[PDB]
Design a protein around this nucleic acid. Structure first.
Ligand code: MG
Ligand code: MG
Ligand code: MG
Ligand code: MG
Ligand code: MG
Ligand code: MG
Ligand code: MG
Ligand code: MG
Ligand code: MG
Ligand code: MG
Ligand code: MG
Ligand code: MG
Ligand code: MG
Ligand code: MG
Ligand code: MG
Ligand code: MG
Ligand code: MG
Ligand code: MG
Ligand code: MG
Ligand code: MG
Ligand code: MG
Ligand code: MG
Ligand code: MG
Ligand code: MG
Lengths: 258, 130, 181, 49
RNA sequence: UAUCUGGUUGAUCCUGCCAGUAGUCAUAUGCUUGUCUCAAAGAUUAAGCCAUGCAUGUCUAAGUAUAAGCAAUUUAUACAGUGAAACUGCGAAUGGCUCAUUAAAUCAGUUAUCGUUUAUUUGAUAGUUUACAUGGUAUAACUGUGGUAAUUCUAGA
RNA sequence: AUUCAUAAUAACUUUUCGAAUCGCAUGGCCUUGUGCUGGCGAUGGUUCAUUCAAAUUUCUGCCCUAUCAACUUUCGAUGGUAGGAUAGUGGCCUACCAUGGUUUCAACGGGUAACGGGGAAUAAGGGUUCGAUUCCGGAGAGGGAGCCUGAGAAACGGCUACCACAUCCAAGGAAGGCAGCAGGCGCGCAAAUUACCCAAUCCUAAUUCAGGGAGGUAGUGACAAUAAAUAACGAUACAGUUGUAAUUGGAAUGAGUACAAUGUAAAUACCUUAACGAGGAACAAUUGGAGGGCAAGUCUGGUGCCAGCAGCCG
RNA sequence: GUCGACGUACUUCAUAGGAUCA
């Protein structure tokens, strides 16, 4: 190619979107934004294929141009805006608030939250550095640059950000025993507690996580997201609380409830 | 008789309407016209007939029942604002706009592309030349 | 371009079509069940071969294997639901004991014949293809329709059919009008 | 022969066929080539004008 | 190959041999072709040549309208609605097509940029340098005068 | 892990940036002035970070060939120093230096009906073959070469030259690139429509609105696949409890036709359905193979009347 | 030139043996 691409084939789209393979030939390409293309849920998919409020892309555009949708407290009018992990989506007309958190299966879930919980979000500190004029700042996983951070905040920590002011209200250090959420790999969507961080210089650090059922799994440090102390997450968790269940157990539960 | 049942009802204040799936039992009848379904749904939901849209009706194999989708807008103005133009044309709410075939418009576009400016100067120039 | 839509062959030619014993077996099957051609028999044989190969492969797995348990339970549940496998024979060994006749008996043609709605398998086929048979509230015109145990008790003449309480067919009212005139 | 071109004409207006199909027919004749036939290439003939 | 058929002599058995019978896929072709669902369309190693048409344009309350444009008017004597043409900005580097070259080249998995560019999106970020606001160092559309057989050609004022 | 982030000092610059822009609304102070102050947005703008990307890059992995054993190095081949150039590392190029680098663990040269992979087929397993072709990546726009613009192109539905073709011409000049969608030629022998639409999918723009042969819709050789009609129930008759019916009774139904409605952007079709639609049910199922029999008939041969060939023809 | 060698593609000849019976 001679420049950036602008089209996305349906078969090439992220699997977790759960798009019909025969509905069309193209899928919404997420516009540039806070979250990476493959880790993001464009607003069209959320409003149409998840909430079912809109029956087609044109109706999604009609909804957005009415300014009814806010992402992290700010109105967005782009159909393919890349909403992503820990993003608060507010619909005032419906009096509804959502937080985009993976379910255990590895797909963004329709998780409703309260207004108080919609006032803040969490962000993994991806970088900490001095800017111009010697003003320290932290860069989080959604591209937010926050100046004058608490000096104790280091990389891999999780900062609680207030959406109204975009200021750090609280922070959580990365340490053993902390409650974490897996945001990548085949263990995506699971919740557990750190046991041990294996450090390899010049390579990828691995973290061993123990879930509530005592199962243990190893994941790269890039996919880990601290969300609180054990049993006391800073956010309301989805149904199932991030616990993986074997196919037989899922069958048993499904038959029991049916 | 005919029985109309609305299922999977969703209230969409974003688009200011109510969506649902209309299941029509019509024993001893071929099928129900969209006009009659719109009138009956308007009577049920206490709305103007203009505010009711219905589409996508397929009669199940063997007859006797049909399934389609239905929308009930909060008032007529919102229906005119949000509804697709073609569906409005079906209901008579809007008049079909008459336009030339795509080939005619495309050829006219190319011919106009060949001209620069308003073209009146070219007209008077060719007139004086000949 | 749009994504491909999957397709598959529901039958296969047997290894040696010309075995005399095989020819006689196909003749008996077609005559007993009123099958139109050898394609239907090949189709049922292909399904049965697939089922039995799956069962054998599961049996090769050690007992208590999660894959064996899950897949074997699902397969036995399906076979019991369609009626091929009896309730008391819920094991993979009895899945290998199935035969084409078991599947053929479940066809809507044979069931319509057996229930007493038709005087022969061919009469049952004609009744089905002419839209006289309803499984529940749904008219079914496919002789190969495989009847489930629950569906077994709901086979009846369709409400729209002249035999099911509807008005007489075209011939009946035609002759009645000519007699009246 | 198999695949022979067959042209379809719908209606007559002002004693004339639709313009589009006649254009298709006119072009088809234009690019046409003719086989050498034994009889016509062995005898002189002429259609009186 | 297997199975089955037939021949091996004056005849019948038992061996052996011999001949024909297996296969889907691919190419070309022949005959037939009623209904429902569904779906593809290469090939002369000729990436050989193309008549004709179309396939890339785009304006919101929010850059520039005294169109001698339209319609409304005294909501508007600076303008104010809609708006051709042209300037300005963006896109045209995406999409679609073909497989010619290419044998550590491409490509697959896996690394690095402490080795560099990045329109756009998102978050931050600029009290330090006639102003009740400067020029043509200027033109388009437009008016008017023209050349050419001819082109999405254009010259002077 | 740094000469990193950042900061400080001395200067330097055809040297930048630090809003002379636009929409809607008319709030608060008073010394009552068209005075002071002030809201929600749009568009620009420096730098950093992020996102979409780009470029280069580390390790391992390609079919046939040894009757291809030495190759590279004069004209960069391997490396060092400095410079130039690039967005940047780098023999990428230049100047000066050394003589290096690859190879029987197959270099180099040659062949390829060689774009690579995900994949397809077969097979009991090992294997063998196929992959232009729905996704990913690369390369090209008749063949070489070179560029303007721009964040991004060595672009070709952009430009300039040359090579080959080729259109108009008043002969002075001018205009070209279907390996895009339709449709032609390449033979004298053949195969989809020069169709409708942006309604869905998504893309472009100043932008909800315009555009989109991208894409969808329909049409068109049985590509590859799924289901499945062409009759069912009886009586009578005839013939050697079996077979045969241009025999016969009244019931069933869709192929097709068609009010209508549904479908669709508009249509066609499907699913529904009034009214028509069956005995030769002529509403006329096909493709191959095997075996007969008949004459005042025809041909060939001979241990009589026979045998072979064969028989649309007497 | 019905030429030699080689390469390639084909054709062809070598199948009956034992036991019983007449
Ligand atoms: Mg690192
Ligand atoms: Mg009926
Ligand atoms: Mg044919
Ligand atoms: Mg027929
Ligand atoms: Mg039909
Ligand atoms: Mg005006
Ligand atoms: Mg411009
Ligand atoms: Mg080579
Ligand atoms: Mg390599
Ligand atoms: Mg832009
Ligand atoms: Mg910005
Ligand atoms: Mg001038
Ligand atoms: Mg250097
Ligand atoms: Mg040098
Ligand atoms: Mg290959
Ligand atoms: Mg090639
Ligand atoms: Mg390929
Ligand atoms: Mg290129
Ligand atoms: Mg060409
Ligand atoms: Mg080029
Ligand atoms: Mg072209
Ligand atoms: Mg192009
Ligand atoms: Mg073409
Ligand atoms: Mg603007």
């Amino acid at each position: 190619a001679r420049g950036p691409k602008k089209h996305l084939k349906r078969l090439a789209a992220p699997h977790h979107w759960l798009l019909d393979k025969l509905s069309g030939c193209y899928a919404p390409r997420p516009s540039a934004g806070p979250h990476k293309l493959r880790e993001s849920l464009p607003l069209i998919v959320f409003l149409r294929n998840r909430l079912k409020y809109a029956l087609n892309g044109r109706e999604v555009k009609a909804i957005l141009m009415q300014r009814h949708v806010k992402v992290d407290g700010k109105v967005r009018t782009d159909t393919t805006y890349p909403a992503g992990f820990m993003d608060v989506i507010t619909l005032d007309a419906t009096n509804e608030n959502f937080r985009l958190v993976y379910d255990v299966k590895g797909r963004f879930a329709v998780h409703r939250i309260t207004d108080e919980e919609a006032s803040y979000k969490l962000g993994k500190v991806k970088k900490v550095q001095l800017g111009k004029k010697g003003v320290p700042y932290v860069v989080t996983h959604d591209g937010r640059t926050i100046r004058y951070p608490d000096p104790n905040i280091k990389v891999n920590d999780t900062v609680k950000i207030d959406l109204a002011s975009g200021k750090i209200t609280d922070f959580i250090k990365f340490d053993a025993g902390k409650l974490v959420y897996v945001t990548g790999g085949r263990n995506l969507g699971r919740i557990g507690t750190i046991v041990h961080k294996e450090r390899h210089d010049g390579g990828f650090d691995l973290v061993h996580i123990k879930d509530s059922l005592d199962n243990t799994f190893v994941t790269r440090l890039n996919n880990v997201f601290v969300i609180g102390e054990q049993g006391k997450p800073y956010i309301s968790l989805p149904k199932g609380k991030g616990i993986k269940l074997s196919i037989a157990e899922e069958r048993d539960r499904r038959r029991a409830q049916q | 008789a005919v029985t109309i049942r609305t299922r999977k009802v969703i209230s969409n204040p974003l688009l200011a309407r109510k969506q649902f799936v209309v299941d029509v039992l019509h024993p001893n009848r071929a099928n129900v016209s969209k006009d009659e379904l719109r009138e009956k749904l308007a009577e049920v939901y206490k709305a103007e007939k203009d505010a009711v849209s219905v589409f996508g009706f397929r009669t199940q194999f063997g007859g006797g029942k049909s399934v389609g989708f239905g929308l009930v807008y909060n008032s007529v103005a919102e229906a005119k604002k949000f509804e697709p133009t073609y569906r409005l044309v079906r209901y008579g709410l809007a008049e079909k706009v008459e336009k030339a075939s795509r080939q005619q418009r495309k050829q006219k576009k190319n011919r106009d592309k060949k001209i620069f400016g308003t073209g009146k100067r070219l007209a008077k120039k060719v007139a004086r030349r000949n | 371009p749009r994504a491909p839509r999957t397709y598959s062959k529901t039958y296969s030619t047997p290894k040696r079509p010309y075995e005399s014993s095989r020819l006689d077996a196909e003749l008996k099957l077609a005559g007993e069940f009123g099958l139109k051609n050898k394609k239907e028999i090949y189709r049922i044989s292909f399904q049965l071969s697939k089922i039995r190969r799956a069962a054998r492969d599961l049996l090769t797995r050690d007992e208590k294997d999660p894959k064996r348990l899950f897949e074997g339970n699902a397969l036995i549940r399906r076979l019991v639901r369609v009626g091929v496998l009896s309730e008391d024979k819920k094991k993979l060994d009895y899945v290998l004991a199935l035969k084409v006749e078991d599947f053929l008996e479940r066809r809507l043609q044979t069931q319509v014949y057996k229930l007493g709605l038709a005087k022969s398998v061919h009469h049952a086929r004609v009744l089905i293809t002419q839209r006289h048979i309803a499984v529940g509230k749904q008219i079914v015109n496919i002789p190969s329709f495989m009847v489930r145990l629950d569906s077994e008790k709901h086979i009846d003449f369709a409400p729209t059919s002249p035999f099911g309480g509807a008005r007489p067919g075209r011939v009946a009212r035609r002759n009645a009008a000519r007699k009246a005139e | 022969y198999q695949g022979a071109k067959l042209f379809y004409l719908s209606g007559v207006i002002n004693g004339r066929y639709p313009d589009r199909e006649i254009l298709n027919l006119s072009r088809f004749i234009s690019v046409m080539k003719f086989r050498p036939l034994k009889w016509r290439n062995e005898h002189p003939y002429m259609l009186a004008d």
